[PDB]
Amino acid sequence: SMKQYEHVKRDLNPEDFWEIIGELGDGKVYKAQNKETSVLAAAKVIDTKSEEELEDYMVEIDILASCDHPNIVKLLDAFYYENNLWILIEFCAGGAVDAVMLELERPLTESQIQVVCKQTLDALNYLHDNKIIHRDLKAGNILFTLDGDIKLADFGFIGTPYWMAPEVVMCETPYDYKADVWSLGITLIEMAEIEPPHHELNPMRVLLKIAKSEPPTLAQPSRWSSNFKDFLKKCLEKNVDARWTTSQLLQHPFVTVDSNKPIRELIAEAKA
Amino acid sequence: SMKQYEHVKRDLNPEDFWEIIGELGDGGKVYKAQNKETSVLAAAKVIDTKSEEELEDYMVEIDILASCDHPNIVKLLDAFYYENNLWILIEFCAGGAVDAVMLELERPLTESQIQVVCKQTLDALNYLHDNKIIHRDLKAGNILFTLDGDIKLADFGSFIGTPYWMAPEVVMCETPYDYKADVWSLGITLIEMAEIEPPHHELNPMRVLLKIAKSEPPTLAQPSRWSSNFKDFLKKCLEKNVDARWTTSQLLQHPFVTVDSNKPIRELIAEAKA
Ligand SMILES: COc1cc2nccc(Oc3ccc(NC(=O)/N=c4/cc(C)o[nH]4)c(Cl)c3)c2cc1OC
Numbered sequence: 134s135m136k137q138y139e140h141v142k143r144d145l146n147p148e149d150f151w152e153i154i155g156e157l158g159d160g161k162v163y164k165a166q167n168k169e170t171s172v173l174a175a176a177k178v179i180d181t182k183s184e185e186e187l188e189d190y191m192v193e194i195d196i197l198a199s200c201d202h203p204n205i206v207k208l209l210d211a212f213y214y215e216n217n218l219w220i221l222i223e224f225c226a227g228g229a230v231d232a233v234m235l236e237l238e239r240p241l242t243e244s245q246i247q248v249v250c251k252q253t254l255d256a257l258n259y260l261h262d263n264k265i266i267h268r269d270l271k272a273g274n275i276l277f278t279l280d281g282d283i284k285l286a287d288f289g290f291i292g293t294p295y296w297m298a299p300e301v302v303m304c305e306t307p308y309d310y311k312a313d314v315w316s317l318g319i320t321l322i323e324m325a326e327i328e329p330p331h332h333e334l335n336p337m338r339v340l341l342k343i344a345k346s347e348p349p350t351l352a353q354p355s356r357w358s359s360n361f362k363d364f365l366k367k368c369l370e371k372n373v374d375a376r377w378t379t380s381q382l383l384q385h386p387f388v389t390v391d392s393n394k395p396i397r398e399l400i401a402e403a404k405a
Numbered sequence: 406s407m408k409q410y411e412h413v414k415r416d417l418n419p420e421d422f423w424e425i426i427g428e429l430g431d432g433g434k435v436y437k438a439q440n441k442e443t444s445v446l447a448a449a450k451v452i453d454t455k456s457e458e459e460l461e462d463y464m465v466e467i468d469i470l471a472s473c474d475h476p477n478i479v480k481l482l483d484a485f486y487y488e489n490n491l492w493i494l495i496e497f498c499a500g501g502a503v504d505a506v507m508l509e510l511e512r513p514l515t516e517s518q519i520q521v522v523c524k525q526t527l528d529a530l531n532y533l534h535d536n537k538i539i540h541r542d543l544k545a546g547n548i549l550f551t552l553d554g555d556i557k558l559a560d561f562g563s564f565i566g567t568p569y570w571m572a573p574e575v576v577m578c579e580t581p582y583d584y585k586a587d588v589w590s591l592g593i594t595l596i597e598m599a600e601i602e603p604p605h606h607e608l609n610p611m612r613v614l615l616k617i618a619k620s621e622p623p624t625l626a627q628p629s630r631w632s633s634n635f636k637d638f639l640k641k642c643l644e645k646n647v648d649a650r651w652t653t654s655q656l657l658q659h660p661f662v663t664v665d666s667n668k669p670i671r672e673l674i675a676e677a678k679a
């Protein structure tokens with residue numbers, strides 16, 4: 134009885150409604166501006182030959198379209214036109230966290246990590262609450278807004294192993310919510326040190342290390358608070374049942390923060 | 406990379422987690438259930454799903470409901486597939502359906518009461534339309550009262566069915582989107598709340614189809630009893646030209662749906678309780 138129409142428009146030119154006004158990253162992500170509202174979007178134009186592949190993407194689009202949280206990036210539009218799939222999502226002016234680290238040539242401060250951790254955790258907890266796993270949480274997928282806030286995105290064969298949880302590597306089997314928590318732990322170290330743990334190792338050797346080795350730690354413990362190192366121990370726990378949920382982590386003192394000023398200042402340096 | 410798990414539990418007995426108290430409607434069977442661990446109240450529907458092709462058809466409706474998050478739309482609390490039954494549990498709305506209240510009390514709603522229901526229902530519908538969902542069966546039987554005096558929109562469930570709420574363009578099979586047909590049905594629902602019965606209720610159902618296709622839009626039986634704001638709101642809903650008929654976004658700007666209080670409905674429930 135209740136019917137939901139498709140989230141991708143058809144037989145309509147995207148550029149009738151959005152002007153491409155530049156390039157943001159090098160596949161290619163574009164910057165677009167709505168011709169009627171002036172709203173800014175990031176746009177991705179993915180080549181969709183296989184109609185079986187379009188259905189595979191449209192699944193990810195449906196999940197994104199149904200999400201409604203301030204710390205998860207919103208889908209503004211989607212089109213199928215002349216065999217391309219355009220995805221337009223809310224523009225996050227501060228850019229990705231990894232790009233900020235590469236531009237400034239510095240890791241984040243603990244104060245900055247703290248804000249990102251708390252907001253990312255709010256996003257993730259909402260996903261988990263709605264039976265969604267992110268699966269690719271890393272610093273490259275955390276975006277800064279302009280007001281100093283985080284939005285979680287997904288920029289896009291086994292792939293890169295650095296953020297993978299031991300139970301996924303060891304194929305230990307109902308749900309994989311905890312794997313996102315592990316990845317959050319790796320992401321925090323990545324923001325503290327620019328690169329994730331084991332970055333210097335061959336990808337095959339990293340799989341071995343994740344399966345066989347003690348959880349990764351910060352390279353220089355004395356530079357960081359006990360709250361932070363403790364928070365890491367809860368995320369980077371190899372026993373899946375001992376590893377904390379996002380709901381438990383929200384009660385941790387490390388994410389008892391109030392101001393987003395560290396991030397406002399970080400993106401004021403980046404803008405200069 | 407993002408993955409969504411299924412909204413329906415499997416290999417698990419629903420009655421491990423929910424106790425059936427009693428029955429709510431035998432108008433299918435809707436049950437009243439209470440969570441064994443939280444004490445939360447639900448309405449439960451236990452639908453027989455022999456056909457695996459039918460289960461997929463229901464699971465689609467469950468996904469839409471699970472993704473909705475609005476105060477004026479009924480929330481899915483749980484869903485199970487167990488021993489060939491599909492259990493659907495949704496938030497319990499203690500006041501029941503609007504049509505049943507009118508039939509029990511033997512009176513229509515007042516304009517003040519219609520105004521609250523219209524505004525809240527319009528917030529729900531506008532949210533649906535915004536998210537590319539059409540309700541398709543908007544009638545007074547699908548508007549539920551809460552204890553507090555609010556509305557939640559529900560859906561109780563080659564045959565044609567009943568015609569009274571059908572839009573002219575659907576009857577005349579004129580055709581991309583049918584958002585406007587919900588707006589027409591909203592108009593019919595308002596008259597239904599003003600008069601208990603929908604327009605043309607006294608006519609043969611075939612003659613109702615004829616009337617919808619061929620006649621001037623339906624009107625209130627006694628226009629002098631109702632404000633100009635209300636009748637004007639109706640004219641925007643019950644416009645046979647689909648392009649002239651207002652969207653829910655346009656209707657939200659209408660003065661009829663500026664309301665600051667649900668007190669008319671709280672008082673309606675206080676009459677019913679007496
Ligand atoms: C200021 O600098 C940037 C700002 C950005 N603001 C918002 C979005 C940006 O890039 C994207 C990141 C992810 C997605 N997509 C996404 O999250 N989901 C999907 C899912 C599928 C199948 O298709 N895309 C998109 Cl569209 C764009 C940005 C890239 C920038 O330059 C670095």
Ligand SMILES: COc1cc2nccc(Oc3ccc(NC(=O)/N=c4/cc(C)o[nH]4)c(Cl)c3)c2cc1OC
Nearest residue numbers: 429430448450466467496497498499501559560561
């Ligand atoms: C006090 O009296 C009642 C109170 C009620 N409170 C809440 C819900 C009630 O009935 C339902 C109404 C709708 C649905 N379902 C619904 O809205 N959607 C779906 C979606 C799918 C696939 O399957 N049903 C259900 Cl379960 C139950 C009620 C029925 C009553 O007695 C009249």
